Amino acid sequence: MKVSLMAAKAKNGVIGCGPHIPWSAKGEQLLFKALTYNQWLLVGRKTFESMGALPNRKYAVVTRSAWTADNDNVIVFPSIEEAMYGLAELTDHVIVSGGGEIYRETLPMASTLHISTIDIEPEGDVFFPNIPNTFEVVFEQHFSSNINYCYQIWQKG
Amino acid sequence: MKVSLMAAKAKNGVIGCGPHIPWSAKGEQLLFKALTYNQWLLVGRKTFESMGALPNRKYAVVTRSAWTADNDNVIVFPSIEEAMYGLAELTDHVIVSGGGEIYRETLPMASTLHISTIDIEPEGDVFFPNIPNTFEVVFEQHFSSNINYCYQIWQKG
Ligand SMILES: NC(=O)c1ccc[n+]([C@@H]2O[C@H](COP(=O)([O-])OP(=O)(O)OC[C@H]3O[C@@H](n4cnc5c(N)ncnc54)[C@H](OP(=O)(O)O)[C@@H]3O)[C@@H](O)[C@H]2O)c1
Ligand SMILES: NC(=O)c1ccc[n+]([C@@H]2O[C@H](COP(=O)([O-])OP(=O)(O)OC[C@H]3O[C@@H](n4cnc5c(N)ncnc54)[C@H](OP(=O)(O)O)[C@@H]3O)[C@@H](O)[C@H]2O)c1
Ligand SMILES: CCc1nc(N)nc(N)c1C#C[C@H](C)c1cc2c(c(-c3ccc(CN)cc3)c1)OCO2
Ligand SMILES: CCc1nc(N)nc(N)c1C#C[C@H](C)c1cc2c(c(-c3ccc(CN)cc3)c1)OCO2
Fold first, then answer.
1. Checking phi first, is residue A32 left (phi over 0); if not, alpha (psi -120 to 50) or beta?
2. Residue B66 has what DSSP assignment?
3. How far apart are the C-alpha atoms of A86 and A60, rounded to whole Å?
4. How many CA atoms lie within 13 Å of A49's alpha carbon, on the beta-carbon side?
5. Which parts of the sequence belong to the DHFR domain (chains A, B)?
6. Ligand 1 pocket check for A124: Cβ under 6 Å
7. What is d(CA B60, CA B50) in angstroms, rounded to the nearest whole number?
């Protein structure tokens, strides 16, 4: 089973400020919706609680507590290793969709990254990890919008 | 100016049947939406007449006749060459978006290809061109839907 990572980050590395994403770039959301359509997503419990089970996707959520979802479209796992083994029975592909913590824990597992860089330098306390040079860009496209953004796809080795 | 080309084709290469696209693969048009957002498209007259001028895009349309368009986001050119020369004064990137005729005439000038292959083999009368082997796949993702589809990004070597 292949692991992809999909994230949006500001030019200063910020991805979150408290429970919010500190920007609104018109259009960027389309990339995320289009590439995750009917895909399995892996997300942290805090991020899942912020966005909820939006339609046409399937969710694997990790928690260290007894937290549960209430939605037959979500599977809660006690660990990332357990989520990976569980998903592997059900799918060939999972897309890691965030939490700052989830990103840092799963970047080493990812063979493909989908990275939107937003032309803004906001304040926030949550940051995307440095992209290791075990990955390289194979595709890139710029978008002009109310806030501009650049979309890149990175592949491993 | 960069030239990309974006197309959805069935597994038998059909892209059209009269003025229609002969399938409904739920989800696939999101890829088209996301990648064309605030982009310039090059379309043929026949294709443009079918879809119409959806928002957040600019259109270059080519025709050999007296056909014109009201919409203020559309520029009509008499030839592919004039459209390319004209677009280059206006944009850094254009996305050829079809017509079988337009695809054949412009594939040689594209640096990047976005191809969705739809899991169907319908009857039709318009076909996508042979992809030269100067292009290679650098990304691929499978989608399950009512009709499955596979998204591939090709780059020219
Ligand atoms: N691309 C983006 O710009 C993007 C995307 C999504 C989110 N965000 C932002 O990121 C911020 C939230 O990130 P965050 O790091 O605070 O939270 P998070 O990663 O969404 O969730 C962290 C939680 O997930 C659970 N968890 C993490 N690793 C686990 C493991 N190995 N095993 C079991 N459970 C595990 C824990 O749940 P418990 O607390 O239940 O134990 C932990 O508290 C928000 O600001 C949000 O807006 C940005
Ligand atoms: N990716 C996809 O699956 C996709 C995308 C788009 C369209 N389609 C399908 O493709 C079919 C349409 O393709 P098509 O080949 O019949 O038509 P088309 O390529 O969309 O348009 C052909 C017309 O474009 C103009 N044209 C072409 N080359 C020109 C040139 N060198 N100089 C000036 N004008 C030029 C001419 O317009 P005039 O007749 O006005 O002179 C010509 O009749 C439809 O069925 C549509 O559903 C599929
Ligand atoms: C485009 C973002 C985006 N772009 C890219 N490149 N990669 C990504 N990983 C994400 C993302 C994301 C998160 C999971 C997300 C995705 C969403 C969300 C919301 C949302 C969260 C909280 C609230 C509460 N106020 C409302 C909505 C959150 O709503 C539509 O989809
Ligand atoms: C999107 C498919 C698609 N996917 C990919 N990868 N590449 C493409 N080049 C196209 C295409 C196309 C054509 C030009 C097209 C042809 C049409 C269309 C529409 C259309 C109709 C309704 C809506 C809803 N807003 C959006 C688009 C789009 O209406 C009938 O004729």
1. alpha
2. S
3. 9
4. 8
5. 2-156
6. no
7. 15
Cα B127 to Cα A106, A110, A148, B9, B98, distances in angstroms = 42, 36, 36, 8, 11
Distance CA A8, CA A97 (A): 10
- Work out the end-to-end distance of chain A between its first and last CA atoms, rounded to an integer number of angstroms: 17
Kindly provide the resolution of this structure in angstroms, with one decimal.
Answer: 2.2
Cβ–ligand 2 contact at B64 (below 6 Å): yes
Ligand 4 atom with the smallest distance to the CA of B54 is 25
> For a pocket test of ligand 4, which of B15, B51, B94, B114 has the largest count of ligand atoms closer than 8 A to its C-beta?
B51
Do B132 and B110 meet the contact criterion of CB atoms below 8 Å apart?
no
Comparing alpha-carbon positions, the chain A residue that sits nearest to B92 is A142
B50, B100 Cβ separation under 8 angstroms? no
Structure tokens at A134: 């075990």
How determined? X-ray
**C-beta atoms surrounding B90 within 10 Å:** 12
Contact B29, B45 (CB under 8 A): no
Q: Which one-letter DSSP state was computed for residue A147?
A: S
Q: How many whole angstroms separate alpha carbon B80 and alpha carbon B98?
A: 13
SS3 content of chain A, % helix, strand, coil (to 5): 25, 40, 40
The minimum-distance atom of ligand 2 relative to the CA of B18 is 45
For residues A125 and B28, give the distance between their C-alpha atoms in angstroms, rounded to a whole number: 36
Taking the mean position of all CA atoms in its chain, how far away is CA B27? 17
B27 CB neighbours in chain A (<8 A) are 34, 37-38, 56
> Which neighbouring-strand residues pair with B40?
B58, B94
Q: Where are the domains of chain A?
A: 1-157
Cβ of B49 closer than 6 Å to ligand 2, yes or no, is: no
Atom of ligand 1 nearest to the CA of A47: 20
